[PDB]
Every structure is written in structure tokens, then in C-alpha cells.
Design a protein around this ligand. Structure first.
Ligand SMILES: Nc1ncnc2c1ncn2[C@@H]1O[C@H](COP(=O)(O)OP(=O)(O)OP(=O)(O)O)[C@@H](O)[C@H]1O
Lengths: 835, 136, 71
């Protein structure tokens, strides 16, 4: 059992006998050295960076402290004086405990003799220490090597410090009545140049039988140290004169072939052991737990209610990101386990300390601060925005753009999936998802802005600007971000007013004036138009129809001013009306914010009742909608995967509508009733449906307020031409929620609020876009009542809906003249083929 | 076929049916094995969540009871497979080799049946007539 | 036969060229590198028997030709 106290320094000196994460390795290694000495002998632990090394190597010494092996204190190569042979510091440390032994025991005859024997070798070693530091040979010292000492046998003449130390440790063992001396080193992560003297000395002087060595470090770092020292042997002239790749290939192989065997001489393979990572200990969800770990989240808790480590991270990942319980949430915790223990503990320590302190109130707010400090290094490497108080959606939308270009994936880039190849990008991906769920939490206007200008800005560049070697592609991003102004956006509607211009400069076959989500209403009148087709006029509509039509407009100056009807403007306008409720006239300004001062310019990369109270009733309906949203804004908890998934469904659904309803203009589009008929107003009715249908599928599939979805087991499609499949989804959901005795607000807050917006109401049921047939009515009549079910009150008057079914009356909440409007390039020539 | 039905999102909507997605379907069913969610969501993984664009380097009745009925068949498949799938042991050689058997079989089938289409080959009973179904 | 019980089940191979080639490619190795990979088997598998036999081989290989991975 392991109980981890988060309110502890967790330093190597402040460890305990039960808080050790790794204990089986500690116990297992202990007998191995004893059996080795029972009857080279260089051990080596292998540790991933941050696994736990200095703390571990201290525990084994503690076990060997209480056959009998004496252990020297741990020596740190980094924290040592430069220009100091490591043979000196071992001897000095050895002398201290031996000198403590001499003044320990009671007999005097041996003590007077043992001390003299110990000092005989020390003087011998001291006079021979000059060989380790001198840079040149002294001919005087030749007469010193010839001089043989007395009373001591040396099988080899000369200085040969190897035997002098070997004889020194042998006498050191007699005084300490031990079998062998344990020499332990420490990690050299901080400065691995200092570790070269450790390897050189071990293979030269610690070749005895009573010395056991336990090294510690990163194995993948030692290899780069030895390889660099191998190249120093080659003469610099040879390394330059012969630069042929044929010779360079064999030279590189020889260096690799040399140090590969060299490391085997120092550390034998059967002696190497590794420290298991945080993942390899607890184990995955499917497999059983090898050695479970329990942590103390709150302070001052009884030991009984200690929570598991995985539940201690799922408490943060699932709640700090508002990510629903599922396999996708397991992606983050699995990645976090693979991180080094030092990083994981510091993330866990900070988040839980602040949550308790706050309790004595936004969970994602507390998690974002923890993640910012932890992966600050990867933030600077990727160049993301890093100023503390400059947070906001304006910066975040720029941040997500930087990440996507780095990841080189425009399809799933805005999903923020931690699946990149470089470790830096994986850290950035999880960090960004934390910030996405912090500002977007508890706000509807902020949600749409993230969807529209954050996620949308990546998709548009992928398909329409990327197709325009990478160095030339580099400046395209530089000017595109300046043109559309991703760094700073004055209004959501203005982005759509700029989005249309970007995509307009991309023609299509037969030059039909219908584009991705937009149609090009003709601003002039073409001679001899068939049927009732004419030039679009705003003044024809009245009431809410004009207000809705005013928002869904945008103009581009391209040597001849072009008019555009868009869905993006309607999406953006809602994100502006729902911003602030403290003023009334602000929403009126939002209605005509862009209709007057548009003056849009072509992008550089492309060459080319009473009028006093006319909108008084419209304001009341919007004002009533303000009270409805403001009481529900608390409930919404968008995630970093919800917005990405919603947009992807939107992109595919919207791309289908703009493609199928392109050749379906056969002079009978006006007064369209059969599904084959398709006019301009028919496309706009489906695009609004394409937005709401896309939300419906993903809102239930992924959301933090619902444990299980209510779509149910069934295939899903998109209403490209038929609303019938969109009708059954609402009907089936209505059945399931009735059984559970649940309302509509507390399950699908996003879908309910959008469907109740007065601005989106007229576009649902236009005059010329409603399908009327024998079976079209069957699904549509239920669909009309289905929408009425969600909204508290009746949508429209029964008589108004009756007129649309059959074929004078004034329409307030229904567009009356967009159907008859023409389209640039849509020369009405052919006729509808019917059978 | 719905899993194999993949739509390439481009200037024109292009749809393909491939045997690999059949291979890619079964290869992911056994991954989760439980929760009745991954297997159910496997039947719809390309419908609207996979919109592949051409690379920049290039030059461009009730279905409610039948849906729950089809799910248990692969649930039936998994429990019968899991009783023997442990005793088998593959290796490096004899798993790459079968792919070369598979890859070359696809080339010959596609090449031969490419020009074996006629105006009356639909559900054709002649040994030479072929259609889209005969390719599959 | 001491390398036969090291590749045939270590790599899940039957009696054939591939199993015999792998013995040869474990024989072209230097004798210092041949001992350590071979010694890792009987030392560890004795502890196991007091399985993951193909994984036990990968355990021995990881410490056998580790450095060539960086190339
Ligand atoms: N028993 C433990 N419980 C929890 N965390 C631990 C435990 N032991 C170690 N750690 C974590 O590991 C850290 C210790 O670092 P580690 O043992 O990896 O040494 P190091 O930094 O590589 O070595 P050095 O500083 O000596 O060069 C602690 O600060 C803590 O984050």
C-alpha cells in the first residue's frame, strides 16, 4: 500500500518507508548484490528523466546500512569542484569512516599497530597522485619508479596506482571487518560532461573484488557522451581530407561499433535494471493493477478514504476540461501518466492545493494556471502567446492557428488531439484544450466566436488558399492573418463579411453564383428574364423578414460591387446580439452594424406600418430572448472537442448542399413545391437547418451535462435535400426524454437556445423553399409541430402555415421575395424533367 | 457498405467503396470489445466525421429494430472468436507474406474486371459478364 | 540447439530457413554479444519457471543491440 501526501515537500530527504512509489525494485536489487559478493561487478540502474533516481538510490543505501557490506555516502559528480580527480574524493570519504573506526574499539595494542598500517598506504598513494594531474612527463620521476619500497609486495613494478588503491581498500576492509565496500554514484543529468571522469575511473581503478559499484543515470545520454570522445582519436587532418560518403559511412560505423562494445565492458547487460514509469506500475484500464497507488487529495484526511491515482487525474481531466466520461477522456490521462513523475507530481500538487484553498470557484480556471507553469518550456518552443494578462478569445484564436501550422494537419487540427510526433506539440495540445474550456465556459456569445473565427479560420485556408516551395507558402499565411485579422477581430459579423471575400475569389465550373454556404443575389436586372424572377429588393419584405435579411448581407468591391447572401453573417450576428443586455439600442445597432459601412476590398493574393416603429415588435421578441438565454448561460459547459466536432459536421453538411443544389435551376424554381425544384430561398432554408442539425448530433454525443446520449442506436446523415431524416431525430429524442421524465433545457442547452432565437425563425419556413408533395407534407407537418413542441409558445399562426402548404396576406415572420430573386450566372434555360 | 462508403470532400463530392475499409472495420471492432458503444459507433465513422480533401500536391419501413439486431451479430462474433484467438501465435515472416498474397490478388481482380462490363451484365449469369457486385 | 530454443519460440518460428537463418544471424554476432543475449534467457526463464517468451527475447535484445537503434 502506498499513500501519497500531496501536502508534503516530496523531497528525497523527506521520504518515508511507505510513500516510496517503487519498492519491488528496491527489494529485488538488494539480494542481487549480496549473492554476487557471497561467492568486474558493476551494477547500473537505468532511469527515464524524472522517474525517481536520487530518491531511489538513497533507499538502497538505507537498506544496506542497517554477509556484511559497508556503504560509502552517495557522491554527486555535478556538485563537485572542477579539476578534481574522483579517486581523491573516494579516498577522502573512505578515510573518514576508517578514522572513526580506529578511535572506536577498546584494545590499544592493535589500535597502535592498525593505525600505522593504514597511514603507510596513504603516504604511498599521496606521493603517486601527480600522475593523474600532470600534463607532461618528468624525467626526474624515473628514479622514483625504480625505487622499490619495503614490507609491501608489488607484483608489478612502477607506480601503477591501480594496485596501490587495490591494496588500500583491502587494508580498509580489515579495519572495518567487512566483506566488501559499496560505492554508489548519482545521476549526471544536470551536467553530463562531468560524468566522463566517472566512466574513465571505474574501468581503471575499481577493478578489485571487494568493491561493488552502483551507477545511476540516463543510458541514452551516456551514448552521446562516449561517441563524442571516440571522434577525438581521429586526426583532424584525416577527418577533413577524406570527406567521401563512401569513407564517411564506414567511419561512422566503426565509431558506433566501438562504443557499443565499450559500454558492455563497463555495465554488463544482466546487471542493468530499469525504473518503471508511472504507467507501467498502475497499468492500463483493461489490465489488472500491479502496484496500486493511493493519494491524499484534501489535507487532514483519514487514511481509509484515499483515492486512486487514476481517479485523482480523472477528477481533473474530466472536470477541468468539461470532457464527458468516455474513452476520449482516457486519452489525456494516459498521456499524463507517461510524463515524468516530477512533472506529474507538480501538476497534481498545485491543482489540488488551490482547489482546497478556493473551497476554504471555476475548476478550469485553477487547472489552466497549473498547466501554464508546468509546460512553459514547450510553450516557448512552439512560440505561443505567453503574456499572463493578455488572455482572451482574441489571443486564443490566434494561438490555435499557430498550433495547426506547426502540426501540419488541417483536418483534425482544431480537435486538439494529443497525437503529434514531437513531444513539444503534445504538451501544447493539452494546454490549449485547457484554455479553450476556460473562457468558453458559461457563455453563449463566447462559444460561437470560438466556433466561427477560431475553428473556421483553419478550414477556409485549407481548401481555398492552400492550393495556391513551402517558402512561398510561408508568406501566404503572413498576409492572410493580416487580411482577415485573426489576431484582433472587431466583430463576429465583420469576420463573415471578410470570409465571403476570401472565398468569392475562387470560381467554379459553369460559374454558378452559389458558393459554400452563400448565394450571389444579382444587384441589377438582366433583360428578358422568364417567369416572375426579378432583382432582389429589401423593401419588399416587412417586419422580422427585413431584419433577418438585413443581417444576412455582405458586399465586396471588385471594380463592380457584388452583393452576397450568407449564413455566416447570421451565425456571427447572433454572437453579437447575445453579448451584453445592459442596453436596448445596442441590438438595433447590431441589426445594421455592417449594412451601411462595409467597403470590403479584394484580398491581395487575388488579382480580381409606420417607419418610426417598424422594428419595434422585432426588438421585443429579441428582448424576450435575452431573458431566456441569460437564465441558461450558467448551464452551458462547452469542451475543446465539442466545438471541433460540431464544425467538422457543419463543413461536410454545408459542402453537400452547395454542390447538389447547383444544377437544379430549371426555370421552375420559383414557387417550388416538389423536392426536385430548388430556388435561392430553398438553399438558405437548408443551410440554417444544416447549422442546427449539426449541433443536434454532436451536442448529445459529446457534452458534460449528459452521461449518455439520447440519439440512440441508429445511422445518421445530413439533410442535403430532405428534412425527413432530421424530423425523426427530434421525434425519437422527444420520446426518450419523456420516459426519463426530463425537460429540454437541462439536456440540450445549445440546441434549445438556438431554436428559440427570433432571428433564425423566418429562415426555417420561407415561401418558395417549403417542399409540398404527397409525402413531403407527411414528414413536414410533424416537423412543423415538432419545432413548436420545443419552443414554449406557438411558432406561427395556423393560417400563415396553411398558405405555404397550398400555394393575399402580409407575412411578418416569413421571407416573401427572396425566392424570386435570381443568381449571377444562373441563366434560366433548361426545364424541369419530371416522370 | 456504409463504413466502406467514404466521401472525398472536394470541389465535387466523390464517393468510394473499398475493401480496405472492410478490413479497417473488423480491425477496430475487437479493440474495445465492450460497452456496446465503439461497435455501434463503428457503423458510422466516415458518414460526417471523415472529410478527406485531395492533397495539395495533386492536380485538384423502420430501421430501429434492425439496428439493434445487427449489433448483436458482431457481439455474437466476438465471444466465439475470443475462445480460440489466444492459442494462435503469428510472427514477422508469415504475416508480411500474406499481405503480398492479398495485395497482388487485389491488383489482378481490379485489372481483369475493369473491362468486363456490358449493357446487359447486371446480375449477369454468364461466366464472363461482370458488374460492380462481381468486383466485390 | 541452444540458439534453436532462443529464436524458434523467441520469434515464433517453426523449423525452416527463417529459424535457421536467425541462428546464423545470431552466430555472426561477436561472442561477447552472443553470451549476453543467450545468458539473459536461461537466467530469466529459470526465475520464470522457478511467461512472455517472445517478450523475454525482446528484453534480451533491448540490452543487446541498443546503441545501433540511434544510428
Ligand atoms: N516517493 C515519492 N513519492 C512521490 N514523488 C516522488 C517520490 N520519490 C521521488 N518523487 C518525485 O521525484 C522527485 C525526485 O527527483 P529524482 O529522484 O528523479 O532525482 P533527480 O532530480 O534526477 O536527481 P538529482 O537532483 O540528485 O540530480 C521528487 O521531487 C518528486 O517529484
Amino acid at each position: 500500500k502506498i499513500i501519497i501526501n500531496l501536502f508534503a515537500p516530496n523531497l528525497p530527504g523527506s521520504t518515508k518507508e511507505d510513500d516510496l512509489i517503487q519498492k519491488s525494485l528496491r527489494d529485488q536489487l538488494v539480494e542481487s548484490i549480496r549473492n554476487s559478493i557471497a561467492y568486474r561487478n558493476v551494477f547500473f540502474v537505468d532511469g527515464t528523466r524524472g522517474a525517481g533516481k536520487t530518491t531511489f538510490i538513497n533507499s538502497v543505501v538505507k537498506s544496506l546500512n542497517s554477509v556484511n557490506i559497508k556503504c560509502l555516502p552517495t557522491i554527486d559528480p555535478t556538485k563537485l569542484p572542477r579539476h578534481e580527480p574522483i579517486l581523491v574524493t573516494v579516498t577522502a570519504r573512505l578515510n573518514k569512516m576508517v578514522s572513526d573506526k580506529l578511535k572506536g574499539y577498546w584494545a590499544s595494542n592493535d589500535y597502535r599497530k592498525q593505525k600505522e598500517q593504514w597511514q603507510n598506504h596513504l603516504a604511498q598513494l599521496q606521493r603517486g597522485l601527480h600522475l593523474l594531474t600532470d600534463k607532461e612527463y618528468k624525467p626526474e620521476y624515473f628514479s622514483d619508479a625504480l625505487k622499490l619500497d619495503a614490507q609491501l609486495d608489488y607484483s608489478i613494478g612502477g607506480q601503477d596506482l591501480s594496485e596501490i588503491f587495490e591494496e588500500l581498500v583491502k587494508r580498509a576492509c580489515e579495519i572495518l571487518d567487512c566483506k566488501a565496500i559499496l560505492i554508489t554514484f548519482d545521476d549526471i543529468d544536470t551536467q553530463f560532461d562531468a560524468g566522463w571522469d566517472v566512466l574513465e575511473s571505474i574501468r581503471k581503478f575499481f577493478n578489485s573484488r571487494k568493491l561493488v559499484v552502483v551507477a545511476t543515470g540516463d543510458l541514452r545520454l551516456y551514448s552521446q557522451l562516449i561517441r563524442g570522445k571516440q571522434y577525438e582519436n581521429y586526426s583532424k587532418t584525416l577527418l577533413e581530407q577524406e570527406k567521401e560518403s563512401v569513407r564517411l559511412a564506414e567511419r561512422g560505423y566503426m565509431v558506433e561499433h566501438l562504443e557499443q562494445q565499450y559500454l558492455l565492458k563497463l555495465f554488463p547487460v544482466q546487471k542493468r535494471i530499469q525504473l518503471k514509469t508511472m504507467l507501467q506500475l498502475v497499468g492500463e484500464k483493461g489490465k489488472a493493477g500491479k502496484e496500486e497507488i493511493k493519494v491524499k487529495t484534501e489535507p487532514g484526511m483519514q487514511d481509509i478514504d484515499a483515492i486512486d491515482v487514476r481517479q485523482a487525474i480523472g477528477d481533473a481531466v474530466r472536470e477541468g476540461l468539461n470532457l464527458r466520461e468516455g474513452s476520449d477522456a482516457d486519452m489525456y490521462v494516459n498521456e499524463l501518466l507517461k510524463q515524468p513523475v516530477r512533472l506529474l507530481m507538480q501538476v497534481l500538487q498545485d491543482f489540488y492545493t488551490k482547489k482546497y484553498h478556493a473551497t476554504s470557484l471555476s475548476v478550469p480556471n485553477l487547472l489552466r494556471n497549473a498547466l501554464y507553469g508546468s509546460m512553459l518550456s514547450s510553450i516557448y518552443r512552439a512560440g505561443l502567446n505567453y503574456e499572463q494578462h493578455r488572455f482572451g478569445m482574441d489571443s486564443l484564436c490566434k494561438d490555435i492557428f499557430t498550433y495547426v501550422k506547426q502540426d501540419r494537419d488541417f483536418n483534425t487540427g482544431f480537435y486538439l488531439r494529443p497525437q503529434s510526433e514531437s513531444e513539444a506539440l503534445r504538451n501544447c495540445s493539452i494546454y490549449l484544450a485547457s484554455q479553450v474550456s476556460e473562457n468558453c465556459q458559461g457563455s453563449l456569445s463566447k462559444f460561437l466566436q470560438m466556433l466561427l473565427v477560431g475553428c473556421g479560420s483553419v478550414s477556409i485556408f485549407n481548401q481555398f488558399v492552400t492550393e495556391l516551395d513551402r517558402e512561398k507558402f510561408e508568406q501566404l499565411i503572413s498576409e492572410y492573418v493580416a487580411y482577415m485579422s485573426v489576431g484582433r477581430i472587431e466583430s463576429a459579423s465583420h469576420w463573415a463579411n471578410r470570409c465571403c471575400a476570401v472565398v468569392a475569389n475562387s470560381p467554379n465550373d459553369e460559374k454558378i453564383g452559389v458558393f459554400l454556404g452563400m448565394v450571389q443575389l444579382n444587384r441589377k436586372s438582366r433583360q428578358h428574364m422568364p417567369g416572375g424572377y426579378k432583382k432582389f429588393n429589401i423593401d419588399t419584405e416587412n417586419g422580422l423578414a427585413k431584419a433577418a435579411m438585413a443581417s444576412s448581407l455582405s458586399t465586396v468591391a471588385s471594380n463592380n460591387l457584388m452583393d452576397f447572401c450568407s449564413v455566416f453573417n447570421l451565425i456571427g450576428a447572433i454572437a453579437d446580439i447575445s453579448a451584453c443586455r445592459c442596453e436596448r439600442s445596442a441590438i438595433t445597432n447590431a441589426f445594421n452594424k455592417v449594412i451601411a459601412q462595409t467597403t470590403c476590398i479584394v484580398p491581395p493574393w487575388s488579382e480580381a406600418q409606420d417607419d418610426a416603429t417598424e422594428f419595434s415588435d422585432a426588438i421585443t421578441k429579441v428582448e424576450q430572448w435575452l431573458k431566456n438565454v441569460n437564465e441558461i448561460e450558467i448551464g452551458i459547459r462547452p469542451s475543446a472537442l465539442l466545438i471541433g466536432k460540431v464544425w467538422s459536421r457543419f463543413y461536410f453538411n454545408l459542402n453537400n448542399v452547395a454542390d447538389q443544389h447547383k444544377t437544379r435551376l430549371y426555370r421552375n424554381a420559383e414557387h417550388g413545391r416538389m423536392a426536385s425544384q430548388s430556388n435561392a430561398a430553398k438553399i438558405m432554408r437548408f443551410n440554417v437547418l444544416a447549422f442546427l442539425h449539426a449541433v443536434l448530433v454532436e451536442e448529445s454525443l459529446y457534452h458534460s451535462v449528459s452521461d449518455r446520449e439520447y440519439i440512440g442506436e441508429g445511422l445518421r446523415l445530413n439533410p442535403v435535400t430532405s428534412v425527413d431524416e432530421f424530423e425523426k431525430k427530434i421525434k425519437i429524442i422527444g420520446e426518450k426524454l419523456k420516459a426519463d421524465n426530463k425537460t429540454w433545457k437541462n439536456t440540450h442547452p445549445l440546441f434549445f437556445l438556438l431554436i428559440s432565437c427570433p432571428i433564425l425563425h423566418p429562415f426555417i419556413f420561407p415561401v418558395g423553399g417549403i417542399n409540398c408533395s404527397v409525402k413531403a407534407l407527411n414528414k413536414e407537418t410533424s416537423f412543423n409541430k415538432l419545432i413548436d413542441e420545443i419552443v414554449g409558445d406557438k411558432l406561427l399562426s395556423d393560417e400563415e402555415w396553411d398558405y405555404l402548404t397550398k400555394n393575399q396576406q402580409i407575412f411578418q415572420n416569413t421571407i416573401t421575395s427572396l425566392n424570386s430573386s435570381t443568381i449571377v450566372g444562373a441563366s434560366y434555360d433548361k426545364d424541369t424533367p419530371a416522370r
